[PDB]
Design a protein around this ligand. Structure first.
Ligand SMILES: [Zn+2]
Ligand SMILES: [Zn+2]
Ligand SMILES: [Zn+2]
Ligand SMILES: [Zn+2]
Lengths: 334, 338
């Protein structure tokens, strides 16, 4: 529609963040609202110290999140850290969790990954319709860690053709292509991997604020990621992997939470459509897991410049955000 | 060799650092001694602001270097920053300079006035005079392509320069790829320098775990097979390879460069014992360069290294600057008689 209003440049419905890190305690209080105010729900990753491996610690964490957000409507979609859980246990938790997140540890390729430890649990998960979320990286050379995990994703897809396997934060053309080879393979894509490549991280001066895992790769990889997100391909969902770290330059992670919607807005207007953004941020997820909502959350973006602050700050913590100091074209009223 | 005395009495004769950055002014006064003490000579890169492009300024900088070294036996091998010099200018400079260093436009630290074209006719007059006058072309071999491919993609350029200027000595500085290790064997006029760090680290050390800015330099450390090929050339003492540290300090993230000057000899000493011979170390650090250029010395500078542990300072301070050294805070198995 050619003519439009400054106050309504984009409208988004029930935006979901399918990969979020909210940390805990004092940090959680600082950053949860930043996601809560722009999303109706987010998959909360379980990599706390120590990791969430039982339902009592999960509920307590859920409660801390609900307190810190203070922006209902916001439903945290809870997850457990992967370990060898038995059928009885999973049956017990299915109504309490959205999924189980696997963090592989110690994988060499010539690989040394034995899925036998996983089989009983994955078989149960399949039958109970519980999705497996995976941080798909081996321990090989940093640029190859994701691509070398492709064969591990294939193996899992064949051995468990009824299990939903979400390849988290894909960053390679390899996985962009693998995604289309198996029906039960899905993926989440971050905001940053649609914009950066390795050159941004170490091509000129080293830029720690753009450092994350998996590392940003090549231009061909970035284009493959953009083609899936911009086309709204049914099996890709937005997952920020917003992962803050207290300001000291060496820890991995990008805190993109507060700038996600505005940056995606601009990105899709320039390269795609409101409808495809709507799919990438919500409809795709809703179609895959059959989600529905009682009270819709509608976010309206206004075409009014603002400068991203150099930090989001609390008494106990200071976090540098993605795009810190940059000027964005769109903004939500908070 | 199964038996030895007091400590590993390893002698090194006339070590040469064929690729070194000494900066200027106050910085020079602080770091120059750290090299002048362990080396008898070093190729001094001209990437100053502004870059050394005339004899007057080169002499001036040389004088500054000589003062900064003081009582040390050390000959700085001077270079000019590459540009389209003519035969007349080159003829007057041949005895004042060791070589001319080519930096591709805006690829590394202080290169904005660099070469932006490798057109054969554009460079012909200069490279032919250099060829006739036996002046060598030292090159920072990287394109502006994707960071991990900058050096390998530069191979076609070194190759055309070699074919078009077959009597020119072309030194591929700080090589970091198997591609250039191999290309070195294809043309008689191709030579190379290798750094200390590139014999040791890969990209994984720089960004595999935590980002380690102290290990960040240009050309970026690459793959395991790249490092192995570099080690095979250095350890075997291959005649066309010479040690060049590319020691480059930065005042205290982060800027590109490793400041390895203070720790080169002992670190190299340990490396060559585990993987090579004292003879091959002597070749890599000195004899190869000496043979390639026909160097001679009024009096030799013999340095002895003993296995007496020592911790590397976390910084090399003074009144004007403070620099973090390579291997900072590390415990080295070898030492030089200070
Ligand atoms: Zn992850
Ligand atoms: Zn994550
Ligand atoms: Zn260089
Ligand atoms: Zn250099």
């Amino acid at each position: 529609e050619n003519l439009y209003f400054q106050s309504n440049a984009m409208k988004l419905k029930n935006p979901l963040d399918m990969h979020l890190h909210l940390r805990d305690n004092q940090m959680l209080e600082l950053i949860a609202p930043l996601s809560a105010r722009d999303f109706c729900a987010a998959v909360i990753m379980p990599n706390l110290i120590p990791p969430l491996c039982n339902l009592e610690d999960l509920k307590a964490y859920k409660m801390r999140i609900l307190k810190a957000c203070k922006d209902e409507n916001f439903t945290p979609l809870m997850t457990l850290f992967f370990k060898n859980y038995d059928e009885k246990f999973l049956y017990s938790a299915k109504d309490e969790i959205f999924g189980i997140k696997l963090y592989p540890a110690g994988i060499t390729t010539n690989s040394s990954f034995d899925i036998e430890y996983l089989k009983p649990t994955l078989e149960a998960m399949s039958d109970l319709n519980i999705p497996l979320l995976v941080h798909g990286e081996t321990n090989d050379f940093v640029m190859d860690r994701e691509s070398n995990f492709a064969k591990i994703y294939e193996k899992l897809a064949k051995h468990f053709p009824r299990l939903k396997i979400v390849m988290e934060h894909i960053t390679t053309k390899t996985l962009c292509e693998l995604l289309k080879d198996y029906e039960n393979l899905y993926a989440t894509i971050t905001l940053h991997h649609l914009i950066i490549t390795l050159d941004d991280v170490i091509g000129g001066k080293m830029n720690p604020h753009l450092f994350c895992k998996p590392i940003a790769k090549r231009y061909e990889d970035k284009e493959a990621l953009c083609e899936l997100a911009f086309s709204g391909y049914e099996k890709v969902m937005f997952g920020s992997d917003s992962a803050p770290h207290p300001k000291d330059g060496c820890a991995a992670g990008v805190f993109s939470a507060p700038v996600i919607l505005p940056v995606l807005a601009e990105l899709f207007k320039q390269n795609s459509s409101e409808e495809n953004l709507q799919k990438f941020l919500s409809d795709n997820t809703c179609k895959i897991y059959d989600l529905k909502f009682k009270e819709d959350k509608i976010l309206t973006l206004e075409e009014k410049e603002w400068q991203v602050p150099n930090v989001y700050e609390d008494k106990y913590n200071q976090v540098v955000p993605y795009m810190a100091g940059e000027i964005l074209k769109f903004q939500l009223k908070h």
